[PDB]
Enzyme design. Structure first.
Site, PDB file in Angstrom:
ATOM      1  N   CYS A 288     -17.613   8.331-101.086  1.00 37.34           N
ATOM      2  CA  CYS A 288     -16.739   7.527-101.567  1.00 37.34           C
ATOM      3  C   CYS A 288     -17.331   6.473-102.261  1.00 37.34           C
ATOM      4  O   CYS A 288     -17.880   5.458-101.754  1.00 37.34           O
ATOM      5  CB  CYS A 288     -15.731   7.009-100.356  1.00 37.34           C
ATOM      6  SG  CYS A 288     -14.414   5.938-101.146  1.00 37.34           S
TER       7      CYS A 288
ATOM      8  N   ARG B 154     -15.793   2.170-101.454  1.00 37.82           N
ATOM      9  CA  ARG B 154     -16.022   1.505 -99.990  1.00 37.82           C
ATOM     10  C   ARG B 154     -16.064   0.054 -99.916  1.00 37.82           C
ATOM     11  O   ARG B 154     -16.118  -0.462 -98.725  1.00 37.82           O
ATOM     12  CB  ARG B 154     -17.115   2.199 -99.283  1.00 37.82           C
ATOM     13  CG  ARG B 154     -16.921   3.624 -98.975  1.00 37.82           C
ATOM     14  CD  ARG B 154     -18.012   4.112 -98.165  1.00 37.82           C
ATOM     15  NE  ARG B 154     -19.114   4.628 -98.906  1.00 37.82           N
ATOM     16  CZ  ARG B 154     -20.255   4.928 -98.686  1.00 37.82           C
ATOM     17  NH1 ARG B 154     -20.775   4.932 -97.586  1.00 37.82           N
ATOM     18  NH2 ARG B 154     -21.279   5.262 -99.819  1.00 37.82           N
TER      19      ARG B 154
ATOM     20  N   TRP C 280      -6.640   3.919-104.419  1.00 38.20           N
ATOM     21  CA  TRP C 280      -6.270   3.737-106.005  1.00 38.20           C
ATOM     22  C   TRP C 280      -7.032   4.596-106.631  1.00 38.20           C
ATOM     23  O   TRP C 280      -8.224   4.886-106.185  1.00 38.20           O
ATOM     24  CB  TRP C 280      -6.050   2.573-106.513  1.00 38.20           C
ATOM     25  CG  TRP C 280      -7.182   1.674-106.124  1.00 38.20           C
ATOM     26  CD1 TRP C 280      -8.225   1.315-106.983  1.00 38.20           C
ATOM     27  CD2 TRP C 280      -7.054   0.663-105.129  1.00 38.20           C
ATOM     28  NE1 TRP C 280      -8.973   0.301-106.426  1.00 38.20           N
ATOM     29  CE2 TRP C 280      -8.340  -0.099-105.145  1.00 38.20           C
ATOM     30  CE3 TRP C 280      -6.281   0.272-104.014  1.00 38.20           C
ATOM     31  CZ2 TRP C 280      -8.510  -1.266-104.666  1.00 38.20           C
ATOM     32  CZ3 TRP C 280      -6.582  -0.883-103.202  1.00 38.20           C
ATOM     33  CH2 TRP C 280      -7.837  -1.406-103.367  1.00 38.20           C
TER      34      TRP C 280
ATOM     35  N   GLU D 189     -11.179  10.098-112.558  1.00 43.97           N
ATOM     36  CA  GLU D 189     -10.703  11.269-111.419  1.00 43.97           C
ATOM     37  C   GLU D 189      -9.532  12.148-112.267  1.00 43.97           C
ATOM     38  O   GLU D 189      -9.201  13.187-112.264  1.00 43.97           O
ATOM     39  CB  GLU D 189     -10.102  10.800-110.256  1.00 43.97           C
ATOM     40  CG  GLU D 189     -11.231  10.229-109.348  1.00 43.97           C
ATOM     41  CD  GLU D 189     -10.460   9.763-108.248  1.00 43.97           C
ATOM     42  OE1 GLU D 189     -10.149  10.349-107.012  1.00 43.97           O
ATOM     43  OE2 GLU D 189     -10.055   8.421-108.088  1.00 43.97           O
TER      44      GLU D 189
HETATM   45  C1  HEM Z   1      -9.292   1.901-102.283  1.00 39.16           C
HETATM   46  C2  HEM Z   1      -9.674   2.574-103.511  1.00 39.16           C
HETATM   47  C3  HEM Z   1     -10.528   3.998-103.440  1.00 39.16           C
HETATM   48  C4  HEM Z   1     -11.119   4.315-104.572  1.00 39.16           C
HETATM   49  C5  HEM Z   1     -11.113   3.600-105.928  1.00 39.16           C
HETATM   50  C6  HEM Z   1     -11.847   5.658-103.984  1.00 39.16           C
HETATM   51  C7  HEM Z   1     -12.701   6.474-104.963  1.00 39.16           C
HETATM   52  C8  HEM Z   1     -12.978   7.536-104.687  1.00 39.16           C
HETATM   53  C9  HEM Z   1     -13.892   8.820-105.285  1.00 39.16           C
HETATM   54  C10 HEM Z   1     -13.851   8.720-106.994  1.00 39.16           C
HETATM   55  C11 HEM Z   1     -13.996   9.666-104.515  1.00 39.16           C
HETATM   56  C12 HEM Z   1     -14.662  11.056-104.990  1.00 39.16           C
HETATM   57  C13 HEM Z   1     -13.455  12.155-104.964  1.00 39.16           C
HETATM   58  C14 HEM Z   1     -13.438  13.305-105.963  1.00 39.16           C
HETATM   59  O1  HEM Z   1     -14.295  12.873-106.707  1.00 39.16           O
HETATM   60  O2  HEM Z   1     -12.631  14.140-105.653  1.00 39.16           O
HETATM   61  C15 HEM Z   1     -13.893   9.426-103.234  1.00 39.16           C
HETATM   62  C16 HEM Z   1     -13.932  10.151-102.066  1.00 39.16           C
HETATM   63  C17 HEM Z   1     -13.795   9.995-100.859  1.00 39.16           C
HETATM   64  N1  HEM Z   1     -12.978   9.021-100.564  1.00 39.16           N
HETATM   65 FE1  HEM Z   1     -12.555   7.178-101.523  1.00 39.16          FE
HETATM   66  N2  HEM Z   1     -11.624   5.810-102.686  1.00 39.16           N
HETATM   67  C18 HEM Z   1     -10.575   4.714-102.330  1.00 39.16           C
HETATM   68  C19 HEM Z   1      -9.962   4.666-100.998  1.00 39.16           C
HETATM   69  C20 HEM Z   1     -10.545   5.548 -99.937  1.00 39.16           C
HETATM   70  C21 HEM Z   1      -9.664   5.248 -98.641  1.00 39.16           C
HETATM   71  C22 HEM Z   1      -8.640   4.285 -98.181  1.00 39.16           C
HETATM   72  C23 HEM Z   1     -10.496   6.260 -97.739  1.00 39.16           C
HETATM   73  C24 HEM Z   1      -9.970   6.642 -96.276  1.00 39.16           C
HETATM   74  C25 HEM Z   1      -9.327   5.845 -95.518  1.00 39.16           C
HETATM   75  C26 HEM Z   1     -11.478   7.258 -98.699  1.00 39.16           C
HETATM   76  C27 HEM Z   1     -11.979   8.053 -98.277  1.00 39.16           C
HETATM   77  C28 HEM Z   1     -12.866   9.030 -99.103  1.00 39.16           C
HETATM   78  C29 HEM Z   1     -13.719  10.347 -98.630  1.00 39.16           C
HETATM   79  C30 HEM Z   1     -13.471  10.682 -97.096  1.00 39.16           C
HETATM   80  C31 HEM Z   1     -14.099  10.819 -99.865  1.00 39.16           C
HETATM   81  C32 HEM Z   1     -14.813  12.212-100.020  1.00 39.16           C
HETATM   82  C33 HEM Z   1     -14.766  13.234 -99.022  1.00 39.16           C
HETATM   83  C34 HEM Z   1     -15.791  14.133 -98.962  1.00 39.16           C
HETATM   84  O3  HEM Z   1     -16.141  14.848 -99.980  1.00 39.16           O
HETATM   85  O4  HEM Z   1     -16.653  14.239 -97.941  1.00 39.16           O
HETATM   86  N3  HEM Z   1     -11.469   6.607 -99.770  1.00 39.16           N
HETATM   87  N4  HEM Z   1     -13.346   8.024-103.188  1.00 39.16           N
HETATM   88  C1  LIG Z   2     -11.639  20.081-101.816  1.00 41.63           C
HETATM   89  C2  LIG Z   2     -12.645  19.238-102.287  1.00 41.63           C
HETATM   90  N1  LIG Z   2     -12.256  18.293-103.531  1.00 41.63           N
HETATM   91  C3  LIG Z   2     -11.838  19.263-104.719  1.00 41.63           C
HETATM   92  C4  LIG Z   2     -13.017  20.099-104.932  1.00 41.63           C
HETATM   93  C5  LIG Z   2     -11.399  17.303-103.019  1.00 41.63           C
HETATM   94  C6  LIG Z   2     -11.813  16.456-101.940  1.00 41.63           C
HETATM   95  C7  LIG Z   2     -11.405  15.083-102.109  1.00 41.63           C
HETATM   96  C8  LIG Z   2     -11.635  14.352-100.689  1.00 41.63           C
HETATM   97  C9  LIG Z   2     -11.483  12.967-100.798  1.00 41.63           C
HETATM   98  F1  LIG Z   2     -11.585  12.652 -99.350  1.00 41.63           F
HETATM   99  C10 LIG Z   2     -10.860  12.374-101.900  1.00 41.63           C
HETATM  100  F2  LIG Z   2     -10.683  11.008-101.709  1.00 41.63           F
HETATM  101  C11 LIG Z   2     -10.695  13.114-103.120  1.00 41.63           C
HETATM  102  C12 LIG Z   2     -10.388  12.475-104.213  1.00 41.63           C
HETATM  103  C13 LIG Z   2      -8.644  11.637-103.973  1.00 41.63           C
HETATM  104  C14 LIG Z   2      -8.883  10.322-103.869  1.00 41.63           C
HETATM  105  C15 LIG Z   2      -8.461   9.511-102.513  1.00 41.63           C
HETATM  106  C16 LIG Z   2      -8.364   8.324-102.239  1.00 41.63           C
HETATM  107  C17 LIG Z   2      -7.886   7.844-101.157  1.00 41.63           C
HETATM  108  C18 LIG Z   2      -8.838   7.617-103.345  1.00 41.63           C
HETATM  109  C19 LIG Z   2      -9.069   7.845-104.563  1.00 41.63           C
HETATM  110  N2  LIG Z   2      -9.572   7.228-105.515  1.00 41.63           N
HETATM  111  N3  LIG Z   2      -9.157   9.316-104.711  1.00 41.63           N
HETATM  112  C20 LIG Z   2     -10.981  14.559-102.993  1.00 41.63           C
END
Ligand code: HEM
Ligand SMILES: CCN(CC)CCc1cc(F)c(F)c(CCc2cc(C)cc(N)n2)c1
Ligand code: HEM
Ligand SMILES: CCN(CC)CCc1cc(F)c(F)c(CCc2cc(C)cc(N)n2)c1
Ligand SMILES: C[C@H](O)[C@H](O)[C@H]1CNc2nc(N)[nH]c(=O)c2N1
Ligand SMILES: C[C@H](O)[C@H](O)[C@H]1CNc2nc(N)[nH]c(=O)c2N1
Ligand SMILES: [Zn+2]
Lengths: 415, 415
Positions: free
Chosen positions: A113, A116, A285, A290
């Site tokens: 993420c 964070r 958000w 994305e």
């Molecule tokens: C607040 C604004 C946030 C932004 C701008 C953000 C941004 C991102 C982005 C760009 C990704 C990559 C996802 C993808 O490419 O599919 C990601 C992944 C992720 N986010 Fe964040 N996120 C936010 C909030 C959160 C919150 C609130 C949580 C959990 C409480 C969270 C947990 C995660 C997790 C667990 C992943 C990746 C899961 C994995 O592949 O292992 N995010 N986030």
């Molecule tokens: C199945 C595996 N992949 C597709 C290949 C998707 C997994 C995945 C796992 C996440 F935790 C995750 F956050 C996303 C992006 C969506 C997202 C969520 C939040 C809270 C903020 C943000 N900015 N964007 C995609």
């Protein structure tokens, strides 16, 4: 060892000691690195009672050693109180303050993420008194309304009852609370979102009536306490959407694209002190890329590079005209501009990757490190003109954590 | 294990068994992945005689088991012949055919190289009879003339005598045969290439007379048999250059940029059957993004995004205008178009990443795998609209190999 990571754009060096606390496993060995495997058999998560108290104690030790009361009387009594309850029930129940801490740190520890820097500003909704899919639907609606906040998006998580035996599981079958449907055509092509074609037809199976168009919002499929899942439609007034226009090209409105404001992942598992929460939808958000890069321009998603290039008057015969690159930038300027003009929270990949470098500095200072997955942190366009491209990052797994889990329709005893 | 890697744009699955032959170490463990560390203390390379024959035997076994004569009489006699010579001298000498095989496979095994579909078309120049820096200069000139081939670039490597004791080392002190100079200014800024400011002043130290401009070609600093290095100027007629223009914006010529045609790395170490070749310059042709993205737009390199954006009429106040992204695409269309109009070999990042996926398929078929570093293979712009973004890749280290080595001016006994 107490390892050093370097930034090669600024020559900054930080020292990681937090990885010594690391517990889980990466998938890598001394002879192979699997840092580009998407779903390694480690990032995915049935546990018994013997294994539980070390995990509770480990978690409780972090919690009390953070509210500035490590080893005190309140700590030792909760240690024993949880020991007693794991003896009695072979499981235990988190306090509300422990749940909020655990959830905030699962996000803090999410190495993939980039968002964070906000980890401590998370609104935690305790839904552990939920018992029916209708209650789930109600809790989810309230989450969607709160997190959206009229376009002034607020980060939030709702936590349903923890797994107990395994056959009684709370699950959201949707991968995200808000997703567009995908339909395969009578010839072969795809209307809407190709990613969701399979799930769109499961809703059709269980009784959904599809408006078979582009940006149709899927219903929620909610499973409570192991029962078969039930369909519910999010009230349209709760689903905020942004029509995508360009601040230059006026044909861009004619493209007729739009996206939803709220990214809310609902298919992952939250682990806290050895307790597993199989339904825990969380939302933030969007980072612009994305939508504009992955959602719109992946070959197996909406795949619009063709049409944008056409209307842009591009040399599409050759590959080395970079017509794909050139249309990709315009598409992303458009996503950003539309959201901003509508007062819907969004962050560009330059501001977000700068904040994560800022966040990394804070973590190495007040924490000794910051686990980070370079492969996922670097944005999918313009990689090296963002500062995370040049930042070496150590990836390791800390708990509390978010994990992947199998889809419910492959593991559920039906009928 | 016999591991599976997946492509998520096409759902293709390949099975890697080649990693079982892997020998070296990655830097990763079960608890930490270091796949984004740039120069791990494993990718860098004094060896004795006991350790040498296992490495010779391992290498010789691959060589004969590839010309279709594993374990035959010629194999067993060369095995013994090399054993005898390692007994006699505590080192040994490769046959010419063994040198060509070893060099081609060091390239084949370079997990960070996206260009490897060409690995078997490599021209090997044997310079192991070289003894003086003047001979080195002569061999290098002939390499530059051959590889350039009037803009119809041809891949090549020149291999100088192998390390023996350690104090007698052949080294090219330049990091690349052809590089532009960098000069720090009386105020503080930088003319030319900031990356080379340090090396530019070492040449100044040893006697170079700098034309203190932008695209000044540095002289060669050549060290033979451990002696102090000596300066030589590559005849200008041998250094082919491409003036960068745009097929649209005519102000682009006024930017006054140009680049050299020949990418030729000269600071790395080639390992073949336990023998170390400390001077082994190798050259190919450019992928466009190396120049247009990294060379031109890195903050600590030429850093031209500012000026291109200005002349493009861009909203530079805000970060979310993506003015940086938008100028980056135009710069790269320009690099490609200039090289092509001048008949100088160059490949765009779409064609090159497609060929590497094609190459990966061939390797899993006729080899059981293809070691690959995703962090380095994905290009530094437009990552996810290229097919390597979506390809899971296993990274592991096979020999023969190219390794990093310390810079000579930190390890050399001078005067
Ligand atoms: C607040 C604004 C946030 C932004 C701008 C953000 C941004 C991102 C982005 C760009 C990704 C990559 C996802 C993808 O490419 O599919 C990601 C992944 C992720 N986010 Fe964040 N996120 C936010 C909030 C959160 C919150 C609130 C949580 C959990 C409480 C969270 C947990 C995660 C997790 C667990 C992943 C990746 C899961 C994995 O592949 O292992 N995010 N986030
Ligand atoms: C199945 C595996 N992949 C597709 C290949 C998707 C997994 C995945 C796992 C996440 F935790 C995750 F956050 C996303 C992006 C969506 C997202 C969520 C939040 C809270 C903020 C943000 N900015 N964007 C995609
Ligand atoms: C023929 C055309 C070639 C192309 C298009 C090509 C392309 C590339 C690119 C883009 C990189 C990344 C470099 C960077 O970003 O700084 C790279 C790295 C590399 N290339 Fe290739 N290359 C070619 C030929 C060769 C040859 C002929 C050799 C050796 C004989 C070679 C060996 C390597 C090595 C060893 C690395 C990375 C070293 C490391 O970081 O470990 N390449 N190549
Ligand atoms: C010091 C580490 N980095 C800078 C941080 C540079 C290392 C490096 C190591 C290589 F082997 C390497 F090939 C390059 C790119 C140059 C190149 C060479 C060839 C033959 C073809 C091509 N297309 N390009 C850069
Ligand atoms: C094969 C590769 O691991 C896969 O394409 C990953 C790469 N990095 C990513 N990074 C982000 N943020 N999101 C993704 O979906 C992916 N996909
Ligand atoms: C920190 C990070 O490892 C570093 O910036 C790497 C990332 N990937 C790269 N990939 C290539 N091809 N070339 C590079 O110089 C780098 N730099
Ligand atoms: Zn790894």
């Amino acid at each position: 060892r107490f390892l050093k990571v370097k930034n090669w754009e600024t020559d900054v060096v930080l020292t990681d000691t937090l990885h010594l606390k690391s517990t889980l496993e990466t998938g890598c060995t001394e002879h192979i690195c699997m840092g580009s495997i998407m779903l390694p058999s480690q990032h995915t998560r049935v546990a018994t009672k013997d294994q539980l108290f070390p995990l509770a104690k480990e978690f409780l030790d972090q919690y009390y050693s953070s509210i500035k009361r490590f080893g005190s009387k309140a700590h030792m009594d909760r240690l024993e109180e949880v020991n007693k309850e794991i003896e009695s029930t072979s499981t235990y129940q988190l306090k509300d303050t422990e749940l909020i801490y655990g959830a905030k740190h699962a996000w803090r520890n999410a190495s993939r993420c980039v968002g964070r820097i906000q980890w401590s500003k998370l609104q935690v909704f305790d839904a552990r008194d939920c018992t029916t899919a209708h209650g789930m639907f109600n809790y989810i609606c309230n989450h969607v309304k709160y997190a959206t906040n009229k376009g002034n998006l607020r980060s939030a998580i709702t936590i349903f009852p923890q797994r107990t035996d395994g056959k009684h599981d709370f699950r959201v079958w949707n991968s995200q609370l808000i997703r567009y449907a995908g339909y395969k055509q009578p010839d072969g092509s795809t209307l809407g979102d190709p990613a969701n074609v399979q799930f769109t037809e499961i809703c059709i199976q269980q009784g959904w009536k599809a408006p078979r168009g582009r940006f149709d919002v899927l219903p929620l499929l909610l499973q409570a306490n192991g029962n078969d899942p039930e369909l519910f439609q999010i009230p349209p007034e709760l689903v905020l959407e942004v029509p995508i226009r360009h601040p230059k090209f006026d044909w861009f409105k004619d493209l007729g694209l739009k996206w939803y404001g709220l990214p809310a992942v609902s298919n992952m598992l939250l682990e806290i002190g050895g307790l597993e929460f199989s339904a825990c939808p969380f939302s933030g958000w969007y980072m612009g890329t994305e939508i504009g890069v992955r959602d719109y321009c992946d070959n197996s998603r909406y795949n619009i590079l063709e049409e944008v290039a056409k209307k842009m008057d591009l040399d599409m015969r050759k590959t080395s005209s970079l017509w794909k690159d050139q249309a990709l930038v315009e598409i992303n300027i458009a996503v950003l501009y539309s959201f901003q003009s509508d007062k819907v929270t969004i962050v560009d990949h330059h501001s977000a990757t700068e904040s994560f470098i800022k966040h990394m500095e804070n973590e190495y200072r007040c924490r000794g490190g910051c686990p980070a997955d370079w492969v996922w942190i670097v944005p999918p366009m313009s990689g090296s003109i963002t500062p995370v491209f040049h930042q070496e990052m150590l990836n390791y797994r800390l708990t509390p954590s978010f994990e992947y889990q199998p889809d419910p329709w492959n593991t559920h005893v039906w009928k």
